[PDB]
Ligand binder design. Structure first.
Ligand SMILES: O=C(O)CNC(=O)C(=O)O
Ligand SMILES: [Mg+2]
Ligand code: NI
Ligand SMILES: [Zn+2]
Length: 331
């Protein structure tokens, strides 16, 4: 078995290997990359996402989210308070202000220590989940707005034609902005490109050990667990690496820098934080190996998780028994 310790793997494709996205994903899996839950892909030196980022300041963040924490430093939840709209230029200035800017630090490890020590005492503002793309239309390789769609994959594998669309999302971050422990909708893959700015640190649990994380989360968040049998679908809970180590949960960590791709694999729980002002783009995707994970994915039916139009069909076709109850949650 390849990669039996489930380490995060880093890949350096050539320009020729960068042509066929599906084929390269399948290559990475042949080397065991999926066992970690997360892989890094450094694009060939000839490649670029677009020519410059000089003209992005007028993009609107219609609903910036203030991420307010509750709990203890290593075990907390966050809720998202909606703020007034602002442009990317206005948000960048805010991220760079004395109130919100990255503190002085020695290296990524020192900054990680400061994040876990101090996150809860601040409420950074995240421009998340903004439909759109910063890939130039002429970028033909690994252009996250030109991938094969999940609906077309399901049709190719299973023969059933379904409604729905699949488009990318932009994330504008600042110091301490945080993504809670989750897997993707329907335990899909994700791909994330860091277009610009400061780094993003990731934590990941191997898919084969995901239920260990879930059992810890039920212990650490006991009211949430009674409220919903899949409450990590709410995307609100944080657990630090120190707490994970104390409870014997297998995980790995890595820092993504500007110009790099990350791929999360089906049922790979991940969480993380931004180091400072940045912009990422991400989308879900599927391969043939996903189908079995989609059929087994947990679902939130309590009403909290509320998701896209396009998840309807996936539930309806892959999980017909769950469909009725899940749809009641969505309505
Ligand atoms: O970058 C973020 O805030 C969160 N992104 C993801 O969870 C992802 O790409 O799967
Ligand atoms: Mg603009
Ligand atoms: Ni994700
Ligand atoms: Zn729920």
């Amino acid at each position: 078995a390849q990669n039996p310790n489930c380490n995060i793997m880093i890949f350096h494709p050539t320009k020729e290997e960068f042509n066929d996205f599906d084929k390269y994903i399948a290559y990475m899996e042949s080397q065991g990359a999926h066992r970690a839950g997360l892989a890094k892909i450094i694009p060939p030196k000839e490649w670029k996402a677009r020519e410059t980022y000089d003209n992005i300041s007028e993009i609107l963040i219609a609903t910036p989210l203030q991420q307010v924490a509750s709990g203890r430093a290593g075990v907390f939840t966050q809720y998202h308070k909606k703020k007034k709209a602002m442009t990317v230029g206005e948000y960048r200035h805010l991220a760079n202000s004395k109130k919100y800017q990255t503190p002085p630090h020695q290296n990524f490890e020192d900054l990680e220590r400061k994040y876990w020590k101090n996150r809860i005492y601040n409420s950074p503002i995240y421009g998340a989940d903004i439909s759109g793309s910063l890939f130039d239309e002429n970028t033909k390789q690994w252009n996250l707005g030109h991938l094969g769609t999940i609906q077309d994959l399901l049709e190719k594998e299973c023969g059933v034609v379904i409604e729905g669309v699949n488009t990318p999302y932009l994330y504008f971050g600042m110091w301490k902005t945080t993504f809670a422990w989750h897997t993707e909708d329907m335990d899909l893959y994700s791909i994330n490109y860091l277009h610009l700015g400061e780094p993003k640190t990731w934590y990941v649990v191997p898919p084969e050990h995901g239920q260990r994380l879930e059992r810890l989360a039920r212990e650490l968040f006991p009211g949430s667990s009674r409220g919903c049998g899949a409450f990590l679908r709410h995307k609100v809970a944080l657990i630090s690496p120190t707490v994970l180590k104390e409870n014997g949960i297998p995980f790995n960590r890595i820092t993504q820098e500007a110009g790099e791709f990350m791929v999360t694999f089906p049922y790979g729980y991940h969480a993380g934080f931004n180091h400072g002002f940045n912009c990422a783009e991400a989308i879900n995707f599927a391969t043939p190996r996903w189908i079995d994970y989609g059929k087994m994915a947990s679902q939130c039916s309590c009403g909290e998780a509320r998701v896209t139009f396009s998840m309807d069909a996936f539930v309806r076709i892959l999980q017909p028994e769950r469909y009725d109850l899940w749809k009641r949650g969505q309505d």
